[PDB]
Design a protein around this ligand. Structure first.
Ligand code: 47G
Length: 330
C-alpha cells in the first residue's frame, strides 16, 4: 500500500504545516501537524476542556462506530518549546492520503497548553519519530508509520515541504519526479528516539564550505533551524545590523536586509537554503526588526534541522531495519 497527502503552511511565514487526516467511521477529518520529532498522535476532542478550545476541529469518539476506549491508558507530553497536552486514549481507524491503519492509538486531549489553544489551524499532532518516545502509559503505543510499515510497498515516508506553498507527505514510495539529482543517504541513530544524523558541515552564502560534524535531528514539527552558536554567529555576521536579542529571544535583523543562503552538508552532497527561507518577518506588527530563521541551539541541548532546513530538500525517512535518512535537492 501507499498514501499521499498534501501538507499546507498554516500562515504566510510557514510557521507550521497541516495535513488532513481521516479518523473514525464515518470519517472525521482533522488537520494535524506531522511531527518527525515526537511520537504521539493526539487530537483536540469532545473531551478537551472547553475554555482550551478556540476554533479547532474536534474528534468526537462517541460518533465513531470504530472507536474503542483503550482502558486505563493515559498520555502526557511536553515539547521543547514548553507547550504541553495530556488526556486519555482511543483506538480507531486512521487514514492519511488513502493509507489506512486500523487500531491506531488516537490520544484524546483533555488539557492543552495555551500555545495550542491559540493556534486555531492545528487540530492536533501526528508523531513520526520512533515509537520508543510515545508517552502512553501503562502500555506504550505505536506511531501511525510503525503501524503502517509492514503493509507499505517500501518501509519509508517522505517529506516535501514547500516554501510559502503546499507540499507533500508520501508513505510507502519515493516519488522520483519530486526531486532533482540523486538522493544522498546518511546514517541515523535511534538512541534518543529521533531521526538523528550528522551533517558534514556548512557554508554561508557564497563562502567556503566548513567541514565539521554537526549532530542533529530532522524535525518537521520544529519551525526553525537550530545550530551551534559558532555556526549561527558565522551566519548572522554576514548580515549588516543583525544581533542576538535577549529580549526578543534570538537573532534579529533589519527587515531591509537581503539574507545570504545557508548550505548544509549531507555526506559529500550539499543542500542550499535560500536566504528568503530564513526570514520570519517583523518581530511584532509594524516593526522593522525581523526574526531570523537560523537560531542557536545552545539552550536546547540538541541541534534541530527544522522546517527552514527540511523545506529546502526532498527528505526520505527510511524505516528499514536499520533506519537511514535521505536528502535531495528539488
Ligand atoms: C504550539 O504548537 C506546537 C508546539 C510544539 C510542536 C512540536 N515541536 C508542534 C506544535 O504545533
Amino acid at each position: 500500500s501507499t498514501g499521499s497527502a498534501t501538507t499546507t503552511p498554516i500562515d504566510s511565514l510557514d510557521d507550521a504545516y497541516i495535513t488532513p487526516v481521516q479518523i473514525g467511521t464515518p470519517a472525521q477529518t482533522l488537520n494535524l501537524d506531522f511531527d518527525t520529532g515526537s511520537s504521539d498522535l493526539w487530537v483536540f476532542s469532545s473531551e478537551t476542556t472547553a475554555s482550551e478550545v478556540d476554533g479547532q476541529t474536534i474528534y468526537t469518539p462517541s460518533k465513531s462506530t470504530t472507536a474503542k476506549l483503550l482502558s486505563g491508558a493515559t498520555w502526557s507530553i511536553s515539547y521543547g518549546d514548553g507547550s504541553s497536552s495530556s488526556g486519555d486514549v482511543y483506538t480507531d481507524t486512521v487514514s492519511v492520503g488513502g493509507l489506512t491503519v486500523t487500531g491506531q492509538a488516537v490520544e484524546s486531549a483533555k488539557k492543552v497548553s495555551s500555545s495550542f489553544t491559540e493556534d486555531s489551524t492545528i487540530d492536533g499532532l501526528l508523531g513520526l519519530a520512533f515509537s520508543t518516545l510515545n508517552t502512553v502509559s501503562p502500555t506504550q503505543q505505536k506511531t501511525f508509520f510503525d503501524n503502517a510499515k509492514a503493509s507499505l510497498d517500501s518501509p519509508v515516508f517522505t517529506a516535501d515541504l514547500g516554501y510559502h506553498a503546499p507540499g507533500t507527505y508520501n508513505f510507502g514510495f519515493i516519488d522520483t519526479t519530486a526531486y532533482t539529482g540523486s538522493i544522498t543517504y546518511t546514517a541515523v541513530s535511534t538512541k534518543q528516539g529521533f531521526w538523528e544524523w550528522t551533517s558534514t558541515g556548512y557554508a554561508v552564502g557564497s563562502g567556503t564550505f566548513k567541514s565539521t560534524s554537526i549532530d542533529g535531528i530532522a524535525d518537521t514539527g520544529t519551525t526553525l533551524l537550530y545550530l551551534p552558536a559558532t555556526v549561527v554567529s558565522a551566519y548572522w555576521a554576514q548580515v549588516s545590523g543583525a544581533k542576538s536579542s535577549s529580549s526578543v529571544g534570538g537573532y534579529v535583523f533589519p527587515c531591509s536586509a537581503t539574507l545570504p543562503s545557508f548550505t548544509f552538508g549531507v555526506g559529500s552532497a550539499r543542500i542550499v537554503i535560500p536566504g528568503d527561507y530564513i526570514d520570519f518577518g517583523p518581530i511584532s506588527t509594524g516593526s522593522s526588526s525581523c526574526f531570523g530563521g537560523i537560531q542557536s541551539s545552545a539552550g536546547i541541548g540538541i541541534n534541530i534541522f527544522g522546517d527552514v532546513a527540511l523545506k529546502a530538500a526532498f527528505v526520505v525517512f527510511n524505516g528499514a531495519t536499520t533506519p537511514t535518512l535521505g536528502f535531495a535537492s528539488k
